[PDB]
Design a protein around this ligand. Structure first.
Ligand SMILES: CNc1cc(F)cc2c(NCCCN)c(C(=O)Nc3ccc(C(=O)O)cc3)c(=O)[nH]c12
Length: 196
């Protein structure tokens, strides 16, 4: 039931993205993709587990958001029969849910560090290539989401603008005293640190 429901939700978002992420021509939807993923990292900070968020603009026009929180739970739900992480990445929940970013990404990479293991999963248009898998051991904890926005969905403004991410991250750091945000642009080495 869940599998059918999930695919219906992905289809819904790709068919009417304006209802979920906003305008797909003028860059507002595109930048909103980053801000949704960051809002999830900020929740993990607000719960008191994440101290540092790192937002990176990569040279291939993907964006990663790294937190140093607990790591999304990885245990297979008895019910849905896939990792708790995969449910969070794929089930449809301002505040539109990461499954919307995933639906509208050509590719999404999830890396979770939790209970001494690295877990990794790759998505394409919100669909998992394979179940979440352990790739190594680690002493660290946290969640990293890197996504490549679908050029089927986004036109015209397709490249992230440093200033637009900077303004919003600075604003989120003002609203959430104590959270520390790094923004780094791999295209030219620019970086900023936002903290109130
Ligand atoms: C870049 N970071 C990042 C991106 C992202 F797209 C999603 C998340 C995310 N879940 C999203 C749903 C909620 N707002 C969590 C989360 O669920 N953490 C979390 C939840 C429960 C437990 C536990 O019960 O043990 C431990 C950790 C997180 O930490 N970081 C995220």
């Amino acid at each position: 039931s869940s599998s059918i429901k999930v695919l219906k939700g992905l289809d819904a978002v790709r068919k009417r993205p304006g209802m979920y992420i906003g305008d797909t021509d003028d860059g507002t939807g595109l930048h909103h993709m980053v801000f949704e993923v960051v809002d999830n990292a900020i929740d993990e900070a607000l719960a008191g587990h994440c101290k540092e968020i790192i937002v990176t603009i990569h040279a291939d026009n993907s964006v990663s958001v790294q937190d140093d929180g607990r790591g999304i739970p990885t245990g297979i739900h008895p019910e849905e029969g896939v990792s708790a992480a995969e449910v969070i990445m794929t089930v449809l929940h301002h505040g539109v849910g990461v499954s919307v970013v995933n639906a509208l990404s050509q590719k999404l990479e999830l890396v979770i560090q939790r209970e001494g293991k690295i877990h990794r999963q790759i998505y394409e248009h919100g669909v998992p290539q394979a179940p979440l898998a352990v790739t190594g051991e680690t002493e660290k904890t946290g969640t990293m989401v890197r996504f490549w926005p679908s050029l089927e969905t986004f036109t015209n403004v397709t490249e992230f603008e440093y200033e637009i991410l900077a303004k919003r991250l600075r604003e989120l750091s003002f609203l959430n005293s104590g959270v520390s945000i790094r923004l780094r642009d791999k295209r030219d080495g620019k970086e900023d640190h936002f903290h109130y």
